[PDB]
Amino acid sequence: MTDFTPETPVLTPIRDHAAELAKAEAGVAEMAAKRNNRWYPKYHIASNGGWINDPNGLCFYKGRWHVFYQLHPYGTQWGPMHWGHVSSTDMLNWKREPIMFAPSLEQEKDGVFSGSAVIDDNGDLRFYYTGHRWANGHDNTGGDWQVQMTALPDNDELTSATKQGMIIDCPTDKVDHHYRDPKVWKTGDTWYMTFGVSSADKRGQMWLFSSKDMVRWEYERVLFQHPDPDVFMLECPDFSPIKDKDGNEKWVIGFSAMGSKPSGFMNRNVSNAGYMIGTWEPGGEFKPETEFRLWDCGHNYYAPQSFNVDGRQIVYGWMSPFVQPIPMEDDGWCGQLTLPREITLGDDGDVVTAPVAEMEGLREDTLDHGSVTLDMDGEQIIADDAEAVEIEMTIDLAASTAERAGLKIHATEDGAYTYVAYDGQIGRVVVDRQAMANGDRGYRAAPLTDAELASGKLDLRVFVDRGSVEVYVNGGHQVLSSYSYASEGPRAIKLVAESGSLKVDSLKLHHMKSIGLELEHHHHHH
Amino acid sequence: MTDFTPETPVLTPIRDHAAELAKAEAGVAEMAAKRNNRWYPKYHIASNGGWINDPNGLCFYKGRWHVFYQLHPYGTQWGPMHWGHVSSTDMLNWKREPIMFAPSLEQEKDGVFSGSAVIDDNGDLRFYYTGHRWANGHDNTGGDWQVQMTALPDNDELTSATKQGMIIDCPTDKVDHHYRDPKVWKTGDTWYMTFGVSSADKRGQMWLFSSKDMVRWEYERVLFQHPDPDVFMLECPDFSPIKDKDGNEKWVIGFSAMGSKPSGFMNRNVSNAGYMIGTWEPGGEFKPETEFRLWDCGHNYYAPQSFNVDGRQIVYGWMSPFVQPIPMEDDGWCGQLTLPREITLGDDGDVVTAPVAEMEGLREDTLDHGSVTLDMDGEQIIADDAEAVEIEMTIDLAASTAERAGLKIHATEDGAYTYVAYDGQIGRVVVDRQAMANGDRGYRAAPLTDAELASGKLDLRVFVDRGSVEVYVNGGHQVLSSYSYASEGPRAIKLVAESGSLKVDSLKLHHMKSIGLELEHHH
Ligand SMILES: OC[C@H]1O[C@](O)(CO)[C@@H](O)[C@@H]1O
């Protein structure tokens, strides 16, 4: 099968797409109607009903931000994959759009898997996505059978699109089933695509294809092979140039890696997404210059996708719940995205992912505490019932003798809480759920460099939403995103010093606005 | 004769000792009469009223175990130092004895500091201790002024002693104030003494002296100087020979070091006690063969003293509360000692400090839970209300996928607890107080060797008392001792697995008897 790259797309409809979309819409609205809002986000993207996963089709196009996502419109576990869709002009007030894709073509009949959206040379958007089949025709026992597909929007609003079919087949001979998650970009006079592959020797790979017209593709080479032989697959690959403030471009390769074994604080989650920084000449293989580093050090983060708009590289992740129990799945929804983060390189040359500047517009108010000191082990109340807030704080590392200090959030009447803390014995920032009464527990610890540790200050920017926390360390040099399933009743926030003093130079709380996606007319505040 | 080793003791009485003892008894009794027992130990040694610190005068003599301890008889913070005293015929049932020493001689007039007991060549006990003066005559603001003293018991019960005065003076110009905490022992045909000193260059040292008759001493040399320049003093030195796995003698040097900077999980407390293993040619310098290691990795442990009984080296530590707040101080007492431990060398050549075997006699019963498994993140109640209990468990590390797992103790209705856990991300046993409602919090983490991590099994022996936890890891290869000031109500114990499975191959609980020092109690 030497030509697994057809000259014209192979289009093979087996179901009526509009009728499948219509079924999907009915499924989501029914879950939304009955949905329990206890842990539902006020300012993160989730489906109005049902399970989501990877963010997809991310773009700014025709004056709107668009976020699509893998969606199961019939329940709160993963199932037949669809694309859901939300859009906004400002990244602050979002509108639920129609479901975008439902399985309707032969090569995607078991699911419309992850993909991306790029603006072409004529300013028109094109979608690329993976079509999924079971290899044995029925379920996962026989592994996956995956190909690359393309589609075009029907209108500037992207409220619908027309499928064109398969553009890249799978040489099953040459791979171990896994063959998915495309990203297309242009460098120079040529378009490139990469997607993740498990080779025949079960090594996680990224393959490179090229094109001059976006629909006809040619295999170039293996762009990257994961150096760890336990790593069998690279899901949701990313590959983008990021500029320093010095005028240089570095290539950042990203992937959601399956198969790594956990080691110390690294790679603790079932699968783990991360990046390497290095160089790339077009057609060639990636040359890494750093070891693998996580995008996000928390409990619940996977499958990040990034996109470029006007020199900005923005990334969303899926807050992935891989570990039982998953309390929210009984509530008519499951899963949310992170806030949008901007990718930059910092002064040390490492990747930094601060929240995008637009996130400041979430703040309804500022309660400025000024500087706060705890002279010894103790706690101060910051909120008695904080549902959706951002806390910004700067710790004077130089003056605080505390061994561990930070915030207890979702601190309820039963004594449960999630702890966000600087830990001076390991020299890290932790999110520790040991005291939580719902969800799996454990802790996650984000590294601080020697310079960050000898610095006089540590900045934390902590977003608490009804079901989650995101901790941005030193302006997003590290981030931890974790679910936190608050118990019932008022949810306090406490500032905490353990075993020594804590000097905080600045502490501010901001209440967060709703992003307009939680709205549901069967829910009467009343 | 300013030379610092008098030919005969310098005896200088300035106060009526009996009257000073009577005043101290009245002070302790006032605190005892109002004591709140909420955190008061059921099976550890504390004063009946007041603050204690270092264990002192430790011995077995004329058919009894004796424990003395630094005592402030007038308050529940540190203050003018006396020695308190308990005794026992079995280590299980203890009695309060008369306060032993109050300051009554010029050279100890601001405190009878730490010291030790040894049995001489004729089978007679002698005491050695430090006499403390404020260097400026008032307060700690001008530093310490310290010398070594001796005394003999007046009877086989050790209920009182005759003081003999000062036997080792301080050469002011060779020392930076600190000069204290004697230990005496015999090697070959010679008696030796060591104590801690801060040199003129502010280095922590143990000096060595020798004697023929245990009363007149001769300076020999500096036995040991701590290799870290930040360490300026070595309090409560210890030095004793221990038989290794091959039947060979090793010398273990111990001290309570002042001035180390915390580094990672090491040396976290205000001051830190520990040991090195090495060799000694009698009369020579100690030669370490190991780096410094802590006796105990927990929050509250300091000033351990050891003594020898029928070939066994037994050690007690003070559970030191150096960090505010100290909520027990409102309750008419402050400070308890650890259980007694035996110092041995393990198969890997490192020190092991298991509870002495007599501690098995604390057990009133055995509740055998057998094998327990948690299949995923979860909790199981092991005891609904545990005031004073010992839990023995073996965890199968090979089978358990949990990231962290263990026992929450003192688990009360307000959701507070102290967590004793294996932590798979750091490969350590931790005691974590973050959720406690009373006292300072934080965590402490005891190391496991690669061989211990590779074995596939982890043994914990956890002693819960009303205000404390002691965790004995792998037979006492490591120990963590910490105060745990439980909240009000029933105090549960829960087995906990986080983010994966926990296989416990064996779990046993034993209720602990009272050692009788609390007298009548309310359960
Ligand atoms: O929903 C299926 C999608 O989820 C992923 O496995 C990553 O979480 C992608 O590889 C795939 O396209």
Ligand SMILES: OC[C@H]1O[C@](O)(CO)[C@@H](O)[C@@H]1O
């Ligand atoms: O109470 C005084 C005693 O306590 C110590 O400082 C150790 O805790 C000793 O060096 C001293 O003899």
Ligand SMILES: [Cl-]
């Ligand atoms: Cl790491």
Ligand SMILES: [Cl-]
């Ligand atoms: Cl509030």
Ligand SMILES: [Cl-]
């Ligand atoms: Cl709120």
Ligand SMILES: [Cl-]
């Ligand atoms: Cl250590």
Ligand SMILES: [Cl-]
């Ligand atoms: Cl009990």
